[PDB]
Every structure is written in C-alpha cells, then in structure tokens.
Amino acid sequence: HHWGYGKHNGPEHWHKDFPIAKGERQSPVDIDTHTAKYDPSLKPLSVSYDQATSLRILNNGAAFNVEFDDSQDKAVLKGGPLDGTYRLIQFHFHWGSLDGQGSEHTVDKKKYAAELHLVHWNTKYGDFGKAVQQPDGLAVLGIFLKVGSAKPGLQKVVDVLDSIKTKGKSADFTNFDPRGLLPESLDYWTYPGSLTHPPLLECVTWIVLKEPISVSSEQVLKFRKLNFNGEGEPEELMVDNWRPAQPLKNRQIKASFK
Numbered sequence: 001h002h003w004g005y006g007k008h009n010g011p012e013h014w015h016k017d018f019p020i021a022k023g024e025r026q027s028p029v030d031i032d033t034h035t036a037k038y039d040p041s042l043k044p045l046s047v048s049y050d051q052a053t054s055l056r057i058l059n060n061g062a063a064f065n066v067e068f069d070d071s072q073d074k075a076v077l078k079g080g081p082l083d084g085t086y087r088l089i090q091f092h093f094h095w096g097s098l099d100g101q102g103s104e105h106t107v108d109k110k111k112y113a114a115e116l117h118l119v120h121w122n123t124k125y126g127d128f129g130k131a132v133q134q135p136d137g138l139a140v141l142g143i144f145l146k147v148g149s150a151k152p153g154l155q156k157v158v159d160v161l162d163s164i165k166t167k168g169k170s171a172d173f174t175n176f177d178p179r180g181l182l183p184e185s186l187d188y189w190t191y192p193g194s195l196t197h198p199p200l201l202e203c204v205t206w207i208v209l210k211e212p213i214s215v216s217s218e219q220v221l222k223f224r225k226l227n228f229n230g231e232g233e234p235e236e237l238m239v240d241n242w243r244p245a246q247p248l249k250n251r252q253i254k255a256s257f258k
C-alpha cells in the first residue's frame with residue numbers, strides 16, 4: 001500500500017514509489033565531525049521568531065506537525081548559508097521506540113533520542129508548493145534531543161498529544177513560542193539535502209545545530225503514545241518514524257565553528 005515506517009512499507013521500500021530515494025543529495029546523513037570543513041565565510045544564523053503565530057497541531061500519520069501562519073514574514077530564518085528570507089511553516093519531530101535511537105542525522109555515528117525539524121520555505125517562490133520544486137526552496141533547522149532534564153518549553157506540546165492520538169486528528173494550538181525549543185548556541189553544520197520522507201524532494205539546505213536540547217524521559221514517553229493508524233483501526237504505536245543515514249556521495253558538510 002502506501003509508504004510508512006513498517007516492515008513492508010518502510011524506508012527500504014520507498015524507492016519503488018519514489019525513485020529519487022536513491023538520488024544524489026538524499027538525507028539524512030552521518031555527520032563526520034573530523035571531515036566537516038570549517039568555513040570562515042559562513043555567517044551566523046539569524047532566527048526571528050518573536051512574531052511567530054502558531055495555528056494548529058496535527059497528526060498526519062507519519063508524525064505530528066505544529067503549523068504556523070506563513071502568510072507574512074512573521075517567523076523567519078536568514079543568514080548562515082542562506083540567500084534571502086525563509087518563512088517558518090511547521091515543525092515536527094522524529095523519535096524512536098527506545099532512548100538510544102530516534103534521530104535521523106547522526107554525529108560520528110551517534111544517534112539521539114529524537115530530532116526536531118523546523119521547516120522554512122524561500123519567500124522568493126511565493127508558496128511552499130512552489131518552493132519544494134527548487135534546489136534552494138527549503139531551509140530546515142535540525143535540533144537533536146537527548147534524554148535528561150525536562151524542557152519546560154516543550155510541555156505545552158506534550159500536553160495536547162492526547163487530543164491528536166490518531167491519524168487525521170487536529171487541534172487548535174495557538175500562542176506557542178518556538179523560541180523555547182532552541183539550544184543556547186547556534187553553531188551548526190550545513191549541507192545540501194532532501195526531505196527525509198516521501199516525496200523525498202532534493203530541495204533542502206540543512207542546518208543542523210551542534211548543541212542538543214535535553215528533554216525528560218516522561219516527555220519523550222508521551223510522543224510514543226501516538227498512533228500511526230486512524231481512529232477505529234488496529235493500534236500501531238507511532239515510534240521509530242526515522243529514515244536511516246544515506247550516502248553522502250558528492251557532498252561536503254561545512255561547519256560554522258572550529
């Protein structure tokens with residue numbers, strides 16, 4: 001049937017319906033910290049989320065998305081390796097069934113409990129749909145999550161998960177400030193890649209933060225109570241919704257720090 005993260009429709013099967021899965025700039029990848037090249041020309045990231053307007057949270061069957069109003073430059077990302085302004089449209093996570101796995105990118109083969117993806121699109125293209133068709137259409141900020149101390153700013157998201165347990169369910173989710181999900185440092189690694197789930201389009205400039213944020217065991221546990229299935233269907237826990245590392249091939253990972 002359609003793609004998923006199960007044994008018969010998982011990542012290893014995606015290439016049949018989405019040939020680009022075996023493309024030249026697929027994500028995620030393993031970040032070899034010793035092979036990454038420090039680029040002194042990379043500017044600091046500029047995150048302007050003070051005017052962010054969250055609208056809704058939704059379970060789309062692959063993860064849960066927190067959506068924002070992207071009709072104006074309210075929450076934008078600029079600087080770094082980017083040219084122009086990128087508007088935040090949504091953020092979601094990828095996590096595992098155990099604390100030892102869950103992230104998509106890895107650092108020197110190290111896996112984290114989860115990975116947060118803040119998706120932004122290049123305003124020069126007018127809308128998200130047009131942006132995904134361009135090589136510089138999206139900018140995704142990736143943040144690693146490690147299990148330890150609780151993250152206060154994530155609790156509001158955790159508490160509403162019960163209302164969107166199954167696929168297709170959505171709930172009003174206003175006044176959420178994404179700034180509460182950022183680590184102290186904005187040092188990063190960057191490389192040209194793709195969306196990590198179908199359609200797997202190669203339209204992403206990845207910006208992966210070096211510093212992970214910590215969340216508590218209890219917070220991640222609640223992520224694991226979501227369902228891939230829709231209401232009224234056999235229960236399948238939403239866990240391990242991550243794609244394994246792909247070949248770096250003809251690409252170089254640059255670091256903003258040395």
Ligand SMILES: [Zn+2]
Nearest residue numbers: 092094117196
């Ligand atoms: Zn993602």
